[PDB]
């Protein structure tokens, strides 16, 4: 029960800290940063769907295994999770312009396993044990603000990935300078949105599992945004010098 939960959290935190350090130097080898020599590859679209599926599925499974699956605040938190992950699993990958037709299996296995552990941990902290997400929490500003940051970051992430989709007609592999929306300010507003999103999750849940996931998302996307930003500035002599990588007007 709680033994596995604490060990899952320790391992996720450890993995996030070590990922942060390494990703400042070597970006995760998918997308524009996919090189040779990363082992066997798999179809890119199937990898995205298969690797993300544990997050909505294992979360719902463990959620329902908790006594408090019938409580209002847990059910609102389930709504936020599934809003994200039904989009991440069954909208984003189906519409994406895939570029390279294959992607490294090792990266997709990491994501699959991460989502298994992270999905279970986050649901476990909500509906199991004592009810901490009472109706009093619904009247706590931390839940309200957290939920609004969740939805704001989610919305920005969705809007940002949609703009990217149209930079490629289906079947194309080209990269274009993204423009409009928040690209007016940062190279990776999709990453900005998702970072803010899971910070909002951490606030609304007030669980160690939510906090570790907000930390892990930052640990992973913040160095990736810097690598994307560096990539843009060397691929395009054209690229706006005023843009930051992730944080408007900062980095
Ligand atoms: N929570 C987390 O820790 C993580 C979650 N995510 C989320 O999942 C989503 C996918 O992330 P990720 O794939 O890294 O996002 P990217 O922005 O790197 O790529 C998303 C899609 O847009 C395409 N694309 C990106 N830039 C351009 C461009 N300049 N011109 C044309 N097409 C472009 C990519 O094609 P191509 O792949 O060929 O570059 C890909 O299909 C994001 O919303 C992200 O926040 C992903 C990683 C970690
Ligand atoms: C009370 C409500 C509870 C609901 C909780 C679970 C929600 C289930 C639905 C998930 C799909 C959401 C997807 C949001 C729309 C996707 C936006 C998008 O990507 O569209 C791009 C456009 O079609 C071209 O670029
Ligand atoms: C050199 C690498 C340093 C090691 C540390 C980095 C590990 C990569 C992140 C794993 C967590 C995944 C959790 C969130 C899912 C992200 C989706 C993804 O990872 O990309 C998949 C790929 O595009 C299609 O298979
Ligand atoms: C997909 C699911 C999306 C979920 C989106 C969640 C957004 C929550 C935002 C604000 C919370 C509302 C505050 C709740 C107000 C309760 C106040 C109260 O306790 O009632 C008044 C009392 O009767 C007088 O004494
Ligand atoms: C209950 C909620 C009801 C709505 C649930 C899902 C809507 C799915 C939204 C996605 C609609 C697909 C639109 C499309 O096909 O656009 C592809 C385009 O190539 C990309 O730019
Ligand atoms: C849900 C509200 C935000 C969804 C953003 C979105 O999917 O639409 C962006 C549009 O396709 C690009 O202009
Ligand atoms: C870009 C703007 C980002 C948005 C800015 C907001 C940042 C908030 C970050 C995390 C929420 C903090 C909550 C983390 C603490 C959760 C764990 C906890 O404290 O409760 C466990 C309890 O003590 C049983 O031991």
Numbering used by the authors: 3 to 253
Anything the authors wrote about it?
Enzymes of steroid 5α-reductase family, which catalyze the 3-oxo-Δ4 reduction reactions, have critical roles in steroidogenesis. SRD5A1 and -2 are mainly involved in the metabolism of steroid hormones, whereas SRD5A3 converts polyprenol into dolichol for the early steps of protein N-linked glycosylation. Both SRD5A1 and -2 are endoplasmic reticulum membrane-embedded and utilize NADPH as a hydride (H−) donor for the Δ4 reduction reactions. In this work, we report the crystal structure of PbSRD5A from Proteobacteria bacterium and homology-based structural models of human HsSRD5A1 and -2. PbSRD5A shared 60.6% and 51.5% sequence similarities with HsSRD5A1 and -2, respectively.
